[PDB]
Amino acid sequence: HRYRPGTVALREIRRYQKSTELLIRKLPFQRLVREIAQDFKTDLRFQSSAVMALQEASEAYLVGLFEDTNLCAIHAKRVTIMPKDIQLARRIRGE
Amino acid sequence: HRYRPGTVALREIRRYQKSTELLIRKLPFQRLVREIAQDFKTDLRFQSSAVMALQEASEAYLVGLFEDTNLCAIHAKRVTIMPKDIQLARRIRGERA
Amino acid sequence: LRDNIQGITKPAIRRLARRGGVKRISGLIYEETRGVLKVFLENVIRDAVTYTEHAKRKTVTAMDVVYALKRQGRTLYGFGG
Amino acid sequence: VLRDNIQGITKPAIRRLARRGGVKRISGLIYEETRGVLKVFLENVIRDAVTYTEHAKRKTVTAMDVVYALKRQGRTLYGFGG
Amino acid sequence: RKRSRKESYSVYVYKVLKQVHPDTGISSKAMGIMNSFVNDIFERIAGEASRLAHYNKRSTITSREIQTAVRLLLPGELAKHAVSEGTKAVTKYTSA
Amino acid sequence: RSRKESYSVYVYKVLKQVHPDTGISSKAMGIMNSFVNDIFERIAGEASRLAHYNKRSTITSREIQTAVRLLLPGELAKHAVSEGTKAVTKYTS
Amino acid sequence: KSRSSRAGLQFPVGRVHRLLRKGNYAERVGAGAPVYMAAVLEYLTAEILELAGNAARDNKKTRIIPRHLQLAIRNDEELNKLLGKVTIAQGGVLPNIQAVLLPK
Amino acid sequence: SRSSRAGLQFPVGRVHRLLRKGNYAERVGAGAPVYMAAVLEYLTAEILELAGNAARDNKKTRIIPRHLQLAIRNDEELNKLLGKVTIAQGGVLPNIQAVLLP
DNA sequence: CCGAGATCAGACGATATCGGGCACTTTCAGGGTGGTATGGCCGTAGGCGAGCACAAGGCTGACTTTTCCTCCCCTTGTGCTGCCTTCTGGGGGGGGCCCAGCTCCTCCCCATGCCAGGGTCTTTTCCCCCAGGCAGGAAAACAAG
DNA sequence: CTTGTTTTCCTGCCTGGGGGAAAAGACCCTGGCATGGGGAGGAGCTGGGCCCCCCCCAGAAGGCAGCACAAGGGGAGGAAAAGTCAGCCTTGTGCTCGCCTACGGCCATACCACCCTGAAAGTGCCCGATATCGTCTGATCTCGG
């Protein structure tokens, strides 16, 4: 038995809107954060609370961006979001 | 002789983007401002510089809104801006959430 | 003192749209923009009037308008600072 | 820890964020755009955080520094001080 | 050695929690967020009142500046009720 | 009778030093006054908050250095801290 | 007695006086400056705690958490406006599904 | 005076008194007004160079709000810095979408 | 690709309102002295951040299938644009006046600096009560028939 | 629409771990004393925003022809979605080193308060000159055939 394409997407949406966990993996997120900070200042140290704060800010920003891009894609009479939708969303909000 | 539909619109676009006048009527914009301030407070006064400030800001605000609604219209496989385009621009900018 | 909003005529909104790069305009854009301008003016007038009442002045001044619009992110130059 | 770390927000993770964002169908070109968006945002915030740290005559990017950096960009973060 | 003691709003947050809903607990992070909330609004209104006074050229920040800063920084219903409660509290402070 | 202080005498002179050929209208000059009365208020206030965060009560020139470094884009910062530090060194030496 | 007890505020009026004085918000700080401002902070905290406890009870939980806090913030229209550019840590998102992306 | 000694054109004394009387912090340093005056001088000169160049390109010898607004909205870094200021009497930059272009 | 038609641009006569210069004053930066107090430097401990094995199992990468979506093309019809004409109010001028905004003097009432002492605020222990795991049961959609 | 098939919420049971109460320190809150300074109130002036009247002409308003683009329908293809399998690396546990942040102590020099002084900016008035109005041509873009 195979589910109709789409219903597991809706199940994922519901399951992932009912939860308050964090979706990116901590170790690669921390590695990326340290790499980014390396350019600003070589050989820095990073508090665990600081890196967790960065994750909980970045993921929320991404969620908001995805919601607005979904609104754009729906406006374009679609269900699929696209880089065009992402670009329009950013260019309108001012980023 | 008549012009094709759109060639007057583009010329009006260029002639106005090259210009800098206040595109709304001053006397009834001031009357609108007075009517709006009426509910907030009775028998208000208004400096002419203040009402000109409000008009010079509102015009720029609406022009920005109309270059964002325009981008929405171009996004939705169209050349005509629409009320739905205005609503999408304002939702995504964050005026009504 | 009634429906000064209609004072913003269809030609004026078309002027603003052509400034904004709009080539074709529907028939409800004018009323939508009238509502939008009414709301924005309500906000800015609220802030400026509150400034004036705090100063206990009876006039609305350009400096009050600049401060009210700065507090909303729409900072206004040229008319004081 | 020095190179090729942007490929850590994997396609399943971006899919998780999008499904939290209400997206049902996701184009295959969305992942490499969201990665870039996150990279630019993180640059925008970590720059200010590192500036706060180096001004404070310190060496450890602190939670308060990160919160200040987010606060400047209109990204007030609740829970980590203030 | 002794370390410099930290400071917070936690006791007052606990009292207001036990006054509004005396039956539901609160987490450590649900405490940090509320501390951030109270101090952020504190800073916002203090800055608003400061700029108001400096523009009006009044050297002392008073209930007038605080009330108008609340009216300017909070959206309608929150501003109205915050102004009302602040006024009723300042009346008691003036009297008692 | 009352008098008002502005930045006009200085703005006109820096104009006559950078572009010594053309002048300024009244409205443009008011624009410039509002601009230099806006960046000033940004930098002084944000340096004040830097001093508050570092638990100080003194706006040293290092606060203003950091304030420029935070409120300006990249090249604007590189070209503003340069002038600030150069002027600071010239002031004593 | 103490200023907080005088007006019934649960909030440190004297500490708010200190913060106003040392915050460099004005050379002089009035005596209504901390009573009024503590009242404002106390009322706003009371409202957000009320709605957050309601959100907690909606999930059969007796321990208020960031989830319930942000649920209250993003469900009440007015407080979302007040805290629009504010990010809550580990709170989730509001559950929304657009009408177009639904089974027919 | 301090302005003459340091070579600064903007009023070092005036900015020092503005910093001191504005209630920013308890004390104000001695490199603070030099730094702030240098910053404002450079930034206003940066605006003026572009504004004068724009005026010259149109064979006009009088700077106007439209000219300054054009300079702001055209220069990339200055556009980011002054990203949300509504310059009075500025208009907008000529820019038409290609899809509406024939 | 051909010619008519409407539109946009330059430029010289001319003009007046506006930008620049001159003289006074009038406020306000600046020099000198005294003094402290916030801050810079040295000492020291300590607590938390960096580097490191060890699984293991949930999670990620990858290949198949199909299925429902995206995208291009046709067509219509319908509201949108372009042009002409009526007439109407925006705009410029001219004057009056009336209350409202800015100044200045007084002096007093609330805000400011300091004393001492305790009462509220802060850090440490502890436990039990509420969050958490988890296997089984019933309810719930789902999709091929 | 019946019925098989996965998914999801519920619940009883036990566990665990960290929040709410108790214990003592600590550090600055409130009352009280002496004070000086900014603002509340009350003339005084004066100045500009409200109000009206009048004339003109340019722009809104309404309609009519006509037209080209928004929207619905059709159809092919193709690329996400759901499913399954192998491998891998996140992380929860437990550990070691060390070094960087902070608290304390000492003093030190540079910025605050306070008096004179002259000097640079704010004010008002006058001179010239520069962007602008008008109209004649010249250049340019547009549209039907």
Numbering used by the authors:
A (entry chain E): 39 to 133
B (entry chain A): 39 to 135
C (entry chain B): 22 to 102
D (entry chain F): 21 to 102
E (entry chain D): 29 to 124
F (entry chain H): 31 to 123
G (entry chain C): 15 to 118
H (entry chain G): 16 to 117
The authors write:
pmcThe specific interaction of proteins with the nucleosome is central to the regulation of chromatin function and dynamics. The tardigrade damage suppressor (Dsup) and vertebrate high-mobility group N (HMGN) proteins bind specifically to nucleosomes via a conserved motif whose structure has not been experimentally determined. Here we used cryo-EM to show that both proteins bind to the nucleosome acidic patch via analogous arginine anchors with one molecule bound to each face of the nucleosome. In addition, to study nucleosome structure in the context of active chromatin, we analyzed nucleosomes that were reconstituted with a promoter-containing DNA sequence from a Xenopus borealis somatic 5S rDNA gene.
To assess the effect of the 10 bp linkers on the flexibility of the core nucleosomal DNA in these structures, we next analyzed a sample of the 147 bp 5S rDNA nucleosome. In the absence of linkers, the 147 bp nucleosome core particle adopts the closed and open I conformations seen with the 167 bp 5S rDNA nucleosomes. However, we did not observe a state analogous to open II, indicating that the flexibility of the core 5S rDNA increases in the presence of linker DNA. Notably, most nucleosomes in our 147 bp (∼60%) and 167 bp (∼95%) data sets adopted unwrapped conformations, agreeing with the increased breathing dynamics of natural DNA sequences compared with the synthetic 601 DNA.
